[PDB]
Structure formats: C-alpha cells, structure tokens
Amino acid sequence: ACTKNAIAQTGFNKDKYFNGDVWYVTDYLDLEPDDVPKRYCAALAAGTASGKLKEALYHYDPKTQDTFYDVSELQVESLGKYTANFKKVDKNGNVKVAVTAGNYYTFTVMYADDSSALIHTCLHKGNKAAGDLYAVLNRNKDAAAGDKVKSAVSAATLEFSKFISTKENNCAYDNDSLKSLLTK
C-alpha cells in the first residue's frame, strides 16, 4: 500500500517542469520491493499539449526486454501534485489498453530545477497492491545526482544511499516517441 503524503516543492515552477522535454530516471527508491525489478529503465516527457497537461511514460526492463509506453492527461490536486489516469499505447500513440477507473498514478514533484528533480509516485493498477516509489530525474540521462537533488532527498528524510541507480543497464531511449506521445 502507499503510505506517503509527499510534499510538493515550495514555489514549484510548473511551466518549467512541464515544458515538453524529457526527464530520465537515474535513481529510484521503491518502499515495497519484491514489487519492482532491481534493474530497470524509465523516462517521461511532461508538457502541455493543446491546453491539456500531459505526461508520456516509457518503461524498459533491460533483462527481460519488457517495454511499454503510456500517456495521461493529468488532473491537478494542488501545485506540484497530480492524478494521472493512464492509457497504455505503442510508441506511436495507438491505444493498447484504454483509460479506466482504478488505473491511475499520483505524481508529486518534491524538488525541481532546470536539470534535476525528485518525485514521488503511487501507482494504482486494478487489483494490484500499490506502493510508494521515489525517483531522481535528470535532463541528462548520464548525470550523477548533484548536491541540489541529493539535499532534497535528505530534506524528505530519505537516504540517497538506499536509492538504486539505473546507470549500469545500457538504457537507450526514444526521445522522439516520448515528445510526440504528449499530443496523443
């Protein structure tokens, strides 16, 4: 189950975060593992498309090759805190699994600047158990976590040493698909 009410960044700059560009997950902390794989790849694009707040997601398991994309129109709970009802799509935006009640994630931006971010997410997917997942993001897929985002991890009363890196997985991303999925 999810247990955290994550606090959004004071003074969160939504237009900068939701600028249409890509964010890569560099490190993550799942509070209820044996539930996500140790080795994983994920990225997202976040932007406004025709007036609608959107996120496109990519997941890739580098060992199994399991791959999937999603798109959601985000609803606002408060500044920096969103609810996202997702649809599974192919890379071109064709629907594989339609939006449904009970398929949603929450999304809280705890820290962001132009190059880095710390987010919390709680995924609800049908009758699957939910659990808290924190992710350190960067605009540069290869960037080591810097002092701004590591300090934010500490300020959330988390230990960065517990986060698992994605950097050793040979992750290659289709940035073009993520950007184009924002419109879909």
Chain positions contacting ligand [N+], by CB under 6 A? 123, 133
Using CA atoms of 110, 113, 116, 120 in order, give the dihedral in degrees to the nearest 10: 10
Decide if residue 93 touches ligand HEM (CB under 6 A).
no
How far apart, in Å, are the Cα atoms of 128 and each of 42, 71, 77, 101, 183? Answer: 20, 20, 23, 13, 29
Binding region for ligand HEM (CB under 6 A) out of 11-19, 33-41, 143-151, 152-160: 33-41
Q: Which residue is nearest to ligand HEM (CB)?
A: 40
Decide if residue 86 touches ligand HEM (CB under 6 A).
yes
Binding region for ligand HEM (CB under 6 A) out of 32-40, 142-150, 153-161, 176-184: 32-40
Residue from 26, 108, 116, 121 touching ligand HEM (CB under 6 A): that is 121
Q: Which is nearer to ligand [N+], 38 or 50 (CB)?
A: 38
The one of ligand HEM, ligand [N+], none whose footprint includes residue 22, by CB under 5 to 8 A per kind, is none
- Residue 124 annotated as lining a ligand binding site: no
Measured distance CA(165)–CA(41) in Å, rounded: 10
Residues that bind ligand HEM (CB under 6 A): 25, 28, 36-37, 40, 42, 44, 57, 59, 68, 70, 86, 88, 97, 105, 107, 119, 121, 123, 125, 133, 135
Residues in binding site for heme: 59
